Write an enzyme that holds these catalytic residues in place. Sequence first.
Site, PDB file in Angstrom:
ATOM      1  N   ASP B  92       8.898 -10.805 108.107  1.00 11.42           N
ATOM      2  CA  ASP B  92       8.593  -9.393 107.923  1.00 11.42           C
ATOM      3  C   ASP B  92       7.950  -9.275 106.541  1.00 11.42           C
ATOM      4  O   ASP B  92       7.807 -10.276 105.837  1.00 11.42           O
ATOM      5  CB  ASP B  92       9.850  -8.510 108.028  1.00 11.42           C
ATOM      6  CG  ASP B  92      10.965  -8.945 107.104  1.00 11.42           C
ATOM      7  OD1 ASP B  92      10.682  -9.441 105.993  1.00 11.42           O
ATOM      8  OD2 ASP B  92      12.138  -8.769 107.486  1.00 11.42           O
ATOM      9  N   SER B  93       7.553  -8.073 106.148  1.00 12.67           N
ATOM     10  CA  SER B  93       6.894  -7.901 104.856  1.00 12.67           C
ATOM     11  C   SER B  93       7.860  -7.752 103.682  1.00 12.67           C
ATOM     12  O   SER B  93       7.483  -7.973 102.528  1.00 12.67           O
ATOM     13  CB  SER B  93       5.972  -6.684 104.907  1.00 12.67           C
ATOM     14  OG  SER B  93       6.725  -5.507 105.125  1.00 12.67           O
ATOM     15  N   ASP B 140       3.949  -2.215 104.953  1.00  9.99           N
ATOM     16  CA  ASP B 140       3.803  -0.789 105.179  1.00  9.99           C
ATOM     17  C   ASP B 140       4.866   0.038 104.475  1.00  9.99           C
ATOM     18  O   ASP B 140       5.758  -0.503 103.818  1.00  9.99           O
ATOM     19  CB  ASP B 140       3.832  -0.499 106.686  1.00  9.99           C
ATOM     20  CG  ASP B 140       5.181  -0.809 107.323  1.00  9.99           C
ATOM     21  OD1 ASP B 140       5.992  -1.525 106.703  1.00  9.99           O
ATOM     22  OD2 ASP B 140       5.426  -0.341 108.456  1.00  9.99           O
ATOM     23  N   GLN B 187       2.822   3.322 112.917  1.00 14.13           N
ATOM     24  CA  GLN B 187       3.732   4.293 112.316  1.00 14.13           C
ATOM     25  C   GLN B 187       3.444   5.648 112.933  1.00 14.13           C
ATOM     26  O   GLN B 187       2.669   5.751 113.881  1.00 14.13           O
ATOM     27  CB  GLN B 187       3.523   4.378 110.799  1.00 14.13           C
ATOM     28  CG  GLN B 187       4.178   3.269 109.987  1.00 14.13           C
ATOM     29  CD  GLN B 187       5.690   3.247 110.147  1.00 14.13           C
ATOM     30  OE1 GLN B 187       6.324   4.291 110.292  1.00 14.13           O
ATOM     31  NE2 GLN B 187       6.272   2.057 110.108  1.00 14.13           N
ATOM     32  N   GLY B 214       9.171   1.971 112.581  1.00 14.39           N
ATOM     33  CA  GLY B 214       9.812   3.256 112.379  1.00 14.39           C
ATOM     34  C   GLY B 214      10.879   3.632 113.386  1.00 14.39           C
ATOM     35  O   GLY B 214      11.514   4.676 113.244  1.00 14.39           O
ATOM     36  N   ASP B 264      13.505  -8.484 117.659  1.00 19.27           N
ATOM     37  CA  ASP B 264      14.235  -9.143 116.587  1.00 19.27           C
ATOM     38  C   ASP B 264      15.390  -8.236 116.192  1.00 19.27           C
ATOM     39  O   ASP B 264      15.204  -7.029 116.025  1.00 19.27           O
ATOM     40  CB  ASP B 264      13.347  -9.365 115.356  1.00 19.27           C
ATOM     41  CG  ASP B 264      13.236  -8.119 114.483  1.00 19.27           C
ATOM     42  OD1 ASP B 264      12.318  -7.303 114.696  1.00 19.27           O
ATOM     43  OD2 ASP B 264      14.088  -7.950 113.588  1.00 19.27           O
ATOM     44  N   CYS B 302      27.672 -17.457 131.332  1.00 20.33           N
ATOM     45  CA  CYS B 302      26.962 -18.100 130.240  1.00 20.33           C
ATOM     46  C   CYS B 302      26.949 -19.613 130.399  1.00 20.33           C
ATOM     47  O   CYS B 302      27.923 -20.210 130.861  1.00 20.33           O
ATOM     48  CB  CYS B 302      27.587 -17.735 128.896  1.00 20.33           C
ATOM     49  SG  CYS B 302      26.549 -18.238 127.530  1.00 20.33           S
ATOM     50  N   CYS B 304      25.959 -21.553 127.701  1.00 23.96           N
ATOM     51  CA  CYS B 304      25.972 -22.114 126.353  1.00 23.96           C
ATOM     52  C   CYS B 304      27.124 -23.105 126.167  1.00 23.96           C
ATOM     53  O   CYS B 304      28.094 -23.096 126.923  1.00 23.96           O
ATOM     54  CB  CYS B 304      26.046 -20.992 125.307  1.00 23.96           C
ATOM     55  SG  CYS B 304      27.710 -20.470 124.835  1.00 23.96           S
ATOM     56  N   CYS B 307      30.801 -21.610 125.839  1.00 25.45           N
ATOM     57  CA  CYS B 307      31.488 -21.188 127.049  1.00 25.45           C
ATOM     58  C   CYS B 307      31.867 -22.360 127.944  1.00 25.45           C
ATOM     59  O   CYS B 307      32.683 -22.227 128.855  1.00 25.45           O
ATOM     60  CB  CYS B 307      30.618 -20.187 127.800  1.00 25.45           C
ATOM     61  SG  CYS B 307      30.556 -18.576 126.973  1.00 25.45           S
ATOM     62  N   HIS B 333      27.126 -18.397 120.858  1.00 25.06           N
ATOM     63  CA  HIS B 333      27.240 -17.736 122.139  1.00 25.06           C
ATOM     64  C   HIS B 333      26.294 -16.546 122.243  1.00 25.06           C
ATOM     65  O   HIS B 333      25.463 -16.488 123.148  1.00 25.06           O
ATOM     66  CB  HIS B 333      28.652 -17.226 122.391  1.00 25.06           C
ATOM     67  CG  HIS B 333      28.716 -16.243 123.517  1.00 25.06           C
ATOM     68  ND1 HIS B 333      28.541 -16.613 124.833  1.00 25.06           N
ATOM     69  CD2 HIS B 333      28.808 -14.892 123.517  1.00 25.06           C
ATOM     70  CE1 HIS B 333      28.520 -15.533 125.594  1.00 25.06           C
ATOM     71  NE2 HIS B 333      28.679 -14.475 124.819  1.00 25.06           N
TER      72      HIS B 333
HETATM   73 ZN   LIG Z   1      28.343 -18.526 126.022  1.00 22.77          ZN
END
Ligand SMILES: [Zn+2]
Lengths: 367, 367
Positions: B92-93, B140, B187, B214, B264, B302, B304, B307, B333
């Site tokens: 980001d800026s 900005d 914006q 914004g 994000d 899940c 992952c 889990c 997770h």
């Molecule tokens: Zn998981």
Amino acid sequence: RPRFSFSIAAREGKARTGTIEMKRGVIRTPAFMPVGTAATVKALKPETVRATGADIILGNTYHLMLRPGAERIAKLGGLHSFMGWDRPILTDSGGFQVMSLKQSEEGVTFKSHGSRHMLSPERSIEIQHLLGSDIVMAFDECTPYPATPSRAASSMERSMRWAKRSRDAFDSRKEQAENAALFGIQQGSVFENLRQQSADALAEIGFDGYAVGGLAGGEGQDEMFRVLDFSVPMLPDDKPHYLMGVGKPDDIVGAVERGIDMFDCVLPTRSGRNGQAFTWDGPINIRNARFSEDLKPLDSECHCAVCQKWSRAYIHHLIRAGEILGAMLMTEHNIAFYQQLMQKIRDSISEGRFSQFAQDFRARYFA
Amino acid sequence: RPRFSFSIAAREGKARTGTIEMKRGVIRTPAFMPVGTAATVKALKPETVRATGADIILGNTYHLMLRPGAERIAKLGGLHSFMGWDRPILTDSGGFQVMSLKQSEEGVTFKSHGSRHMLSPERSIEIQHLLGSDIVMAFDECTPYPATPSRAASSMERSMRWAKRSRDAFDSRKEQAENAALFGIQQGSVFENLRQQSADALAEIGFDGYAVGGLAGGEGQDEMFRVLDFSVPMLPDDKPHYLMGVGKPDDIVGAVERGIDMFDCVLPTRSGRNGQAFTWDGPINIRNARFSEDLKPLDSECHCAVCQKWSRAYIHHLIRAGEILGAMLMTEHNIAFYQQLMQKIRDSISEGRFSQFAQDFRARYFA
Ligand SMILES: [Zn+2]
Ligand SMILES: [Zn+2]
């Protein structure tokens, strides 16, 4: 594999290298046991702990009985299952932390660091069973340093009585007597005659291993080594010798030279988060400004994943920023370092060049 | 691979799925970018981040310029090299954090959360170059919520002027213009005519991607969606549409239904340490007593590693004990959950059944 089998493959002076076979796995000795405070080895997944080369970890009975509780862990399948570690686990009795963090011949009652709790030879052994510990430590009364001859004797004598009670309690529990091992603890502070009496008592009772307790209590390395000099030899030779709470690299080397087979210390773990990183050229404080732009790994020779992928500058930044990843990497490194130390110790004894290794290690470590 | 290539493989309504090819790798869109606050995605090794399925991470310019500093990271080889992540990174800026954690047409000067610092379109772009960012955000002036028509216009107008300056600054740096991409930011707060003017301005300048800025400023999901309804369509269709700071699972689904390609948010990361775990049946607070002895994984479906190997009871214990491992597992997770969400979104759009997926997801998530 058998419940317990300690075989010595090689010796050099008082030093020994071999293996301990247990249901859950083999333990190469001399061994270093990482510490799993509250069902976790600080900042590390058990697979990462295993990746460092550890064959066994230690679990703190005191913390566990407080949070999440012995009975709960048992209901949840045991410690191994609870935390994801399927290899051997040694659990202390909890006695030390009770005193460190109403005593009587029956045992001790205390207030949680505010709940009230009781601990005795019987209850300690039971809790360790609930946790599903592979190697159980007898419950004893630690003797503060320094201690008078009269007080040291009184504590050692009580400890010996408690050792018999731990032994009997352990044996009365079928599943435990058949799948786990029991270690007795030698007391007597720094008095040879007491240590001898303690060794005699433990041997008469009979244990799978013998720990040397009461050391690493602020007496200094020399006093400790001096006590080990005459203490370890009193212990049965054909069983593991476990030095409790000793883990400074140089302490380990010296203890092994004096017949010790097992170590445990929170140093590599605790020091990790505080920024202390162990290297073959001595420990460093990664938080120091001199490492802000140092691109080399924590240690030039280390083979751990941390030294293969990240720089001191990065870890320096992480620790000073309070980033969790900093603690993760530091700890993996330190534990990895420790395991490599034990490996070098085991290889050197096995090749009859341990004395030389001890000399080379100290020369460089303290350079 | 090319410097930048966004190709849309499938569409459904305003939703799009495709890929962004960049020197460092391919980004599957819609995409979720984990947040790397201070050169680290909280409690996770970059390999673990990658293991969750993330194709790109976001870096906070503000924190980085403060600690360890843009110039230092550059001297150390860049962000990718510094933290161990070799895939695309969007930075980001820094403008937002400056205001969140002396403004003028030239830029802004501020005191570190006590050092003094300056930030402007030129300096923001430069810092991002020093970090070695793959996708650069134009600098900005954010407009607080709520904002008046006059103030919103003044900020959007300045932002548009700053966008041109960011564009020019980016192009004046050969290495950056040739290997990185630049995103402009729309914006105008909640005013359609301003958003339209902003979209027109950015398009005339020309960027590789357009972010909708914004939003996620405390206006509520409905107001946001309403603004997206008319805002996203104003943006060039053949370029990525990036919604900044929006990451609640339900927000993401709705934004994608409105043409957004990139997200994000620090939610999955921050919420991880606070004990909030995302599941397909809605978020849960693992610290809640109801999970003390729950042996099921955080989420039934899940895939992952967390889990697959640990229970809620264990993670429950870790979080309430303040154990680092708790934060490690929770975060892995949550991020893993988020990536699987994006995958399901990409597959559903690609198969023309996204609208149905959106309905099924909300029904179960809010059940
Ligand atoms: Zn998981
Ligand atoms: Zn290392």
